[PDB]
Amino acid sequence: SSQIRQNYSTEVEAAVNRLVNLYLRASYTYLSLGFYFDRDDVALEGVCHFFRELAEEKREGAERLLKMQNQRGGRALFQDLQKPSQDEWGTTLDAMKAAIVLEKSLNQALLDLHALGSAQADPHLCDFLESHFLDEEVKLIKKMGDHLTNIQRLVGSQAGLGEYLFERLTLKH
Amino acid sequence: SSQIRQNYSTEVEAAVNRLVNLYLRASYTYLSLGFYFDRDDVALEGVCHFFRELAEEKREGAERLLKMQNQRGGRALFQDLQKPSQDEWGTTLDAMKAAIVLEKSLNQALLDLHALGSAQADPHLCDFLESHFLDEEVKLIKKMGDHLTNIQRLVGSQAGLGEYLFERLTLKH
Amino acid sequence: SSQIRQNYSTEVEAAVNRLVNLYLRASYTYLSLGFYFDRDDVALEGVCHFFRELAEEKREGAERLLKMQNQRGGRALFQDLQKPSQDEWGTTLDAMKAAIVLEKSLNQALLDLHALGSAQADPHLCDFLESHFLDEEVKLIKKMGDHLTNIQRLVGSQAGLGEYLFERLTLKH
Amino acid sequence: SSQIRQNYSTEVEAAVNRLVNLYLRASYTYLSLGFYFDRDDVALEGVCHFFRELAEEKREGAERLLKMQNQRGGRALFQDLQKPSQDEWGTTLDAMKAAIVLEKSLNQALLDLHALGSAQADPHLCDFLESHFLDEEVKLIKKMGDHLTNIQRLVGSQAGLGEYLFERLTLKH
Ligand SMILES: [Ru+3]
Ligand SMILES: [Ru+3]
Ligand SMILES: [Ru+3]
Ligand SMILES: [Ru+3]
Ligand SMILES: [Ru+3]
Ligand SMILES: [Ru+3]
Ligand SMILES: [Ru+3]
Ligand SMILES: [Ru+3]
């Protein structure tokens, strides 16, 4: 048992374990999205790389949460990772909408955990979130919003042409 | 009071202060334009950077005018900066039209100040304008004209597609 | 309209727009102060450079606020910038007192916005302020306080001599 | 006789020769000022170097005028250089006042020559003046004005102390 734990409620410990699960699950979802865009009959490499990079970022988020849990003398508990919600992700637009939906749910979970730590007078937790998650998430959501607007602008009359141009001219590949 | 002032009429001094206000006001207008194009629901980074760069150029124009005013033994007097004329700037085309309108008004103010200095036999003023403002403004207006033509060429049938391509392929980002 | 906005109250959005105006207005005030010290009949270059550097810092503060507003899915709204409170700023001492007064008002506005975001459970806002404004402002106010003390120490019997020495030996030029 | 002269009036040619004399005479005056400040019983090296640098600048001004006269197919005619107006130049303040008086007379001569060339429709002359003399002179006069203000600020109660500090802390040496 921990000899270090101090000011670290059971409620926060549990919610941290839940948030780890949410991040690993987001990572899995992004792995599925990335490989869908690598299919021969989809073949949008920039979209593929964007989601693969997100899978790695979400995994790193979970790892940092796990490190913190141990730093505080909490105990990591893992649950099943639920499979992603779809086997096929539709167009780049459907996918980017899905990604924003997912990020908004992770953001609300961060905000909920922050409100918990504030209620429990756990400033270390609040600052950990502030310093490594809250702004990173706002920045990512703004970027997705930006992309979504550009994707939408491009559907207009010839969706295929728009979808190709977005991937070629905005996304990194 | 100044021990240096020589051949520097009260009329030119006042018109210099007015032109400072016009440049600061142009800078403000460009700041608003730039941030409008950074909105998540507009999201045209090259257009954003173009206007932000203009805001900085207009501010530098005002600073040079202020430096000159002091060099001549004139006294800087500042007025309120009126807010920009619009809160939302429409399409890239609407914005570039607005920018050309603004630049033509600044250019006419330079020309009016030049005619004043010529009437007052103030060759230092005339040369200051010639050397740092008149050609810079002609060059900028030609560039905006060029852009406007390309934007217009691209509206044709699918305005969204045109607007994306212009920002991606002409504007710096 | 924004597809990204989350946990971002109308009250904070409006107060952010107000704070942008306050920073731009502080920038303008500093521009006037800087050019007053560049007058031939004032001629204190270190004081000039100190205020000019502040004008740039305040402008950068506003730009960061504007960036954040967009990151959150808020809408930038600009008002008139009121002219600075004085056309002539007196001695270096009068000017530094004026600057501290101005900074204290900006600091109280930051603190008021922080209390709002805390009341609205907006930790991203609170952390943005904490991370880019609150300490920067405390540090600047301490520096102005330090200067003011040294200026005051130097007025004693021969104010002109003191004013020259401060500018030559403390301020950067 | 010249095979190149074109649009170059006898009036401008003569006034150019006069202005050469005025610049050489200013150079001589500055040579006397510089050596006065190198006297063992004056001994203000920064003041000495400031005037010596001005003597060289005024000489270079004359040389450029002479080059131009030949470029235009005019004929250089030299007159006596009148000795400087004083054998002893008083305090740094007296000297800097004298220097500003001299520069204002040279500036008015430039302005008078410019008005002549404008009346004679001689744009090459007007531009030569604009490009190499008018702004250089405005800049120099502003610098002298700045110095004079600082010198004046420092006389106050202990003139010797002020005079030493100005030379040590403003002037280059
Ligand atoms: Ru907190
Ligand atoms: Ru850390
Ligand atoms: Ru002219
Ligand atoms: Ru110049
Ligand atoms: Ru807080
Ligand atoms: Ru940041
Ligand atoms: Ru001319
Ligand atoms: Ru030349």
UniProtKB/Swiss-Prot annotation, chains A, B, C, D:
Location of the Ferritin-like diiron domain: 6-155
CDD domains (alphabetical): Ferritin
GO molecular function, one term: iron ion binding
One Gene Ontology cellular component: cytoplasm
Biological process (GO), any one: intracellular iron ion homeostasis
InterPro entries on file: Ferritin, Ferritin-like, Ferritin-like_diiron, Ferritin-like_SF, Ferritin_CS, Ferritin_DPS_dom
Protein residues bound to Fe cation: 53, 56-57, 60, 63
Places the protein is found: Cytoplasmic vesicle, Autophagosome; Cytoplasm; Autolysosome
Region annotation (Catalytic site for iron oxidation) ranges: 53-60
Amino-acid biosynthesis in keyword set: no
Keyword tags: Acetylation, Cytoplasm, Cytoplasmic vesicle, Iron, Iron storage, Lysosome, Metal-binding
Record-listed N-acetylserine modification sites: 1
Major subcellular site: cytoplasm
Family: Belongs to the ferritin family.
Quaternary structure and partners: Oligomer of 24 subunits. There are two types of subunits: L (light) chain and H (heavy) chain. The major chain can be light or heavy, depending on the species and tissue type. The functional molecule forms a roughly spherical shell with a diameter of 12 nm and contains a central cavity into which the insoluble mineral iron core is deposited. Interacts with NCOA4.
Task of the protein: Stores iron in a soluble, non-toxic, readily available form. Important for iron homeostasis. Iron is taken up in the ferrous form and deposited as ferric hydroxides after oxidation. Also plays a role in delivery of iron to cells. Mediates iron uptake in capsule cells of the developing kidney. Delivery to lysosomes by the cargo receptor NCOA4 for autophagic degradation and release or iron.
Further remarks about this protein from its record: In horse spleen the light chain is the major chain.
Protein's recorded name: Ferritin light chain
Species this chain originates from: Equus caballus
